[PDB]
Amino acid sequence: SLFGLASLRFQGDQHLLDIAFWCNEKGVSARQQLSVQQQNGIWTLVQSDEKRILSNVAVLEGAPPLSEHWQLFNNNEVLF
Amino acid sequence: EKIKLFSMLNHEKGLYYLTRDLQCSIDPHNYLFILVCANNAWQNIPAERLRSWLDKMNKWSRLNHCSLLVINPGNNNDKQFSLLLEEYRSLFGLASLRFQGDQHLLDIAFWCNEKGVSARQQLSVQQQNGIWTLVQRSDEKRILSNVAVLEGAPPLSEHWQLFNNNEVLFNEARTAQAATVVFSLQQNAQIEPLARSIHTLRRQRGSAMKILVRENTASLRATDERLLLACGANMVIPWNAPLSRCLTMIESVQGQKFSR
Numbered sequence: 001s002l003f004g005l006a007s008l009r010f011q012g013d014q015h016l017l018d019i020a021f022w023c024n025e026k027g028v029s030a031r032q033q034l035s036v037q038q039q040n041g042i043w044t045l046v047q048s049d050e051k052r053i054l055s056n057v058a059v060l061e062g063a064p065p066l067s068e069h070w071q072l073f074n075n076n077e078v079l080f
Numbered sequence: 081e082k083i084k085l086f087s088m089l090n091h092e093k094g095l096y097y098l099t100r101d102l103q104c105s106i107d108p109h110n111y112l113f114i115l116v117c118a119n120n121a122w123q124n125i126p127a128e129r130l131r132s133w134l135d136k137m138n139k140w141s142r143l144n145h146c147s148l149l150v151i152n153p154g155n156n157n158d159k160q161f162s163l164l165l166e167e168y169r170s171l172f173g174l175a176s177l178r179f180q181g182d183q184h185l186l187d188i189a190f191w192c193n194e195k196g197v198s199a200r201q202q203l204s205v206q207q208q209n210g211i212w213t214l215v216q217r218s219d220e221k222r223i224l225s226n227v228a229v230l231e232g233a234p235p236l237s238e239h240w241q242l243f244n245n246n247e248v249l250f251n252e253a254r255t256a257q258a259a260t261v262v263f264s265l266q267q268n269a270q271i272e273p274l275a276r277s278i279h280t281l282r283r284q285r286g287s288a289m290k291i292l293v294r295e296n297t298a299s300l301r302a303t304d305e306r307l308l309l310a311c312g313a314n315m316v317i318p319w320n321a322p323l324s325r326c327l328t329m330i331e332s333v334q335g336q337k338f339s340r
């Protein structure tokens with residue numbers, strides 16, 4: 001008899017939002033815990049490249065990237 | 081101590097009349113249904129009629145306080161699975177079991193009972209002496225391929241494993257569950273036993289595993305490609321396309337299940 005159950009508990013500086021279950025046309029979620037803050041009356045949710053390969057799309061003769069570390073560029077200006 | 085055994089005709093009318101027949105036969109209050117259908121029995125049921133039947137079954141279950149379980153052996157129920165997901169209101173639990181050679185994977189899209197609600201759980205259950213016991217996704221990123229596929233190229237990523245021939249590759253894929261398996265074709269003599277290996281890889285391992293065959297030499301026909309597709313291979317990469325085309329074809333089947 002419920003398409004979603006949520007509770008918001010005050011915890012001093014931020015509120016904790018606990019959704020036991022939730023139904024939506026995009027799916028159903030269960031047992032979600034999140035933190036929200038009331039900033040000026042607004043509830044807002046709280047918040048190396050050695051292997052990454054950057055090459056032109058013409059490097060692979062137009063073929064898509066080899067792997068996740070491969071990123072393509074149409075011309076050698078966006079790549080630059 | 082005792083249960084009631086019921087037989088119905090392999091037809092849509094039997095499923096449609098199930099409610100009235102059981103009402104004429106059994107008082108459904110505090111009573112459980114287990115509907116074990118035949119192989120691909122739910123393939124001929126249209127979408128709208130299936131939705132109406134599910135709604136009627138749910139209303140009847142609520143009115144009679146009776147629980148219904150349906151076990152459907154099928155291989156191409158992905159659209160049916162999506163339809164079941166769309167009717168999550170009437171439903172209160174959807175589970176799928178995928179055979180993976182040595183173990184079985186139980187995926188519960190959702191489940192609601194008196195002790196709470198769980199959504200999108202994945203567990204491993206095995207069949208020991210005919211008993212289903214839980215074993216207390218994981219290798220989906222991992223890619224298994226033949227050395228000749230890369231034409232000498234090193235592993236493209238950490239998730240890449242290379243094998244000399246398509247024999248130890250099948251042995252490793254026997255242990256893998258969701259890894260991407262890529263074969264290499266060199267001559268005509270490899271068409272049949274690789275086809276057999278693919279058949280095994282599709283029977284022991286379910287639709288989660290990705291099976292691909294790279295053609296390195298022009299030694300293929302349309303009939304052989306159709307046979308490879310029927311054995312369980314997602315698609316066969318033509319020899320004309322360069323290696324990066326093969327790699328992007330591999331990337332295409334990521335997140336896809338072999339429903340054929």
Ligand SMILES: Nc1nc2c(ncn2[C@@H]2O[C@@H]3COP(=O)(O)O[C@H]4[C@@H](O)[C@H](n5cnc6c(=O)[nH]c(N)nc65)O[C@@H]4COP(=O)(O)O[C@H]3[C@H]2O)c(=O)[nH]1
Pocket residue numbers: 268298299300301304
């Ligand atoms: N250009 C051309 N010639 C054709 C074709 N089909 C047959 N032939 C000729 O007929 C011979 C006998 O082929 P088969 O009886 O089909 O029996 C063939 C076939 O079963 C197989 N085979 C040969 N090449 C291929 C191939 O590229 N793919 C596949 N899947 N099987 C092949 O090996 C057998 C021996 O074939 P070959 O030694 O090539 O010798 C071939 C070839 O000279 C065709 O589509 N194109």
Ligand SMILES: Nc1nc2c(ncn2[C@@H]2O[C@@H]3COP(=O)(O)O[C@H]4[C@@H](O)[C@H](n5cnc6c(=O)[nH]c(N)nc65)O[C@@H]4COP(=O)(O)O[C@H]3[C@H]2O)c(=O)[nH]1
Pocket residue numbers: 298300301302303
């Ligand atoms: N019934 C019949 N159909 C024929 C014959 N020759 C060619 N075809 C048809 O032509 C298609 C493509 O022409 P292809 O140059 O033979 O294209 C062939 C050819 O280059 C090669 N190939 C296949 N089998 C053989 C073979 O036995 N020998 C040789 N030398 N090449 C073959 O593989 C390609 C793929 O062939 P498919 O996918 O089967 O598709 C073949 C096949 O359906 C023939 O003698 N009988």
